[PDB]
Paper text:
Earlier we described circularly permuted GFP (cpGFP)-based Ca2+ sensors Case12 and Case16 with superior dynamic ranges of up to 12-fold and 16.5-fold increase in green fluorescence between Ca2+-free and Ca2+-saturated forms. The overall structure of these sensors is a monomer consisting of cpGFP “core” in its typical β-barrel shape inserted between an M13-peptide and CaM-domains. An alternative approach is to insert the single circularly permuted green fluorescent protein (cpGFP) between CaM and M13-peptide (fragment of myosin light-chain kinase).
However, under “crystallization condition A” we were able to freeze the Case16 sensor in its “half Ca2+-bound state”. Therefore the initial Ca2+-dependent fluorescent response of the sensor in 100–500 nM range of Ca2+ can be determined by the structural rearrangements in response to filling of the first two high-affinity Ca2+-binding pockets of the C-terminal part of CaM. In agreement with this data, the structure A of Case16 reveals that only the two C-terminal Ca2+-binding sites of CaM are occupied with Ca2+ whereas both of its N-terminal sites are Ca2+-free. The CaM domain is in its open extended conformation and the M13-peptide was bound only to the C-terminal lobe of CaM. Most likely, this particular CaM-M13 binding mode is mediated by the two complexed Ca2+ ions and an aromatic residue of the M13-peptide (Trp9) penetrating into a deep pocket of the C-terminal lobe of CaM. Based on the resolved structure of Case16 we propose that binding of the M13-peptide to the C-terminal lobe of CaM in the context of the sensor stabilizes the arrangement of the 7th β-strand of GFP in its natural position. Case16 structure A demonstrates that Glu148 contacts the cpGFP chromophore directly, which is consistent with our previous conclusions based on site-specific mutagenesis.
Residue numbers in the entry: 1 to 20, 23 to 106, 126 to 188, 192 to 325, 330 to 416
Amino acid sequence: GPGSSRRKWNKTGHAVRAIGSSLENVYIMADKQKNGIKANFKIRHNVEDGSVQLADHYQQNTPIGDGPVLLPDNHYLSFQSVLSKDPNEKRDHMVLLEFVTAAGSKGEELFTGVVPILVELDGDVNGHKFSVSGEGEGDATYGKLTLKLICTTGKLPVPWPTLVTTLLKCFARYPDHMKQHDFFKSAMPEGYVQERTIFFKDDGNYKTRAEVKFEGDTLVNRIELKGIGFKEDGNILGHKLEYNSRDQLTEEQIAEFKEAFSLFDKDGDGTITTKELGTVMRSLGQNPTEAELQDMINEVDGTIDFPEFLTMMARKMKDTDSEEEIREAFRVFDKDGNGYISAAELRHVMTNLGEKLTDEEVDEMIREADIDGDGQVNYEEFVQMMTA
Ligand SMILES: [Ca+2]
Ligand SMILES: [Ca+2]
Ligand SMILES: [Cl-]
C-alpha cells in the first residue's frame, strides 16, 4: 500500500533531481565572412513564483577594423556568475563576479596581469530610460572578472539578472595553446563589436550593441541597449525575478578557494596539477572519495584551471533538495505545465525512465500523494512526497 508508493515517489524524484544554476556553456562558432564569431545560447532566469523565464540570446562579434585577428575552431566557453550586494551601497546596484574558461599575439600580452575595467550602458526599455555605470578588474590568468555596477538614473526599470550577459569574454581563461584560438584578446587593443538580440519568452526583447576595447590601460565596455514588446505586468518590468540563489558560491568562499588554489600554482599559471586536487580540496575542509576525485579529474580531459576548480566546488554544496531543484523536478512530471500531475503524465515518466509499473501501481501513487482528493498531484502535494 502507502509505503511502497511513497518510496516510488521519493526514489524516482531523487533520480530526476540528481540530473544536475550559476553555470552555463556557450558554443562559439567561427563566422568566416565578417571575420568574427557568433553564438546562440539560452539563459534560464528563476522567477519568484517558482517558474522560469527563458532568455534566448543570439550574438555576433566583429573586430573594430582592421588587419590580423585570426579565427578559432568552434569551442565552448563555460561561465559561472556570482551576484551579490554591497551592504554599504544605498543606490540600486549589482556586484557581479564571473569565472570563464575555454574547453576544446600582441593582444594576449595585454591580459597577463590585473586589468582595470570601465562599463557603461545606456538603456531604453519600453521608453523607460536608464544608465548603468560600472567599474572593476579582470584577471584572465584566473578567468576572472569582477564588477560593481550602479544605476545612475535611480531605480533600474528591469531586473539586474537580465543585464548580466550584456554587462567581457576577453577575460576568459584559454588553456595551453587554445590561445591561437582566442578571438577576444587578439582583437585588442582596437577591440571588437559585440551585438545581441535577446528574446524573453512570452515577453519582450533586447538589442544591444557594445564596443569592448582599450582606452589607455583601461578595458572599456560601452553599451547601447533598446527593449520593446515587454509586459508592464510581466516578469521583467514587474521585477518578478530572483536576484540570487541560496546555494550559490560566496564572495568570501571564493577568496579562500583562490588563495588555496594559488598556493599550489607553482608556475604562476593559474593552473594546478591533477594530482594536487585532493590536497587542495582537503585544505578547504572537504573530504572527497578516492573515485569521486577521479571523476572530477577525468571530466577535466593534465592540469586544472581556476574556473574549472570553482565549478567542482560549486557542484558540492549545490543543495540536493532545493526549493528550485524540486520545482524543476515538478516540471519533468507535469509535461503540459498546467500545474497538476495526472495519472497519464506519471505513467509517461515511469515508462520513459524504465520504471516498470502497472496501472494499479500508478493509481496508488497518485492516491497516496493526492491530499485534496481531486485525482491529481499539485505542487505542494508533490513536495510532500519529495521530502524526507
Ligand atoms: Ca499536467
Ligand atoms: Ca490533488
Ligand atoms: Cl538574460
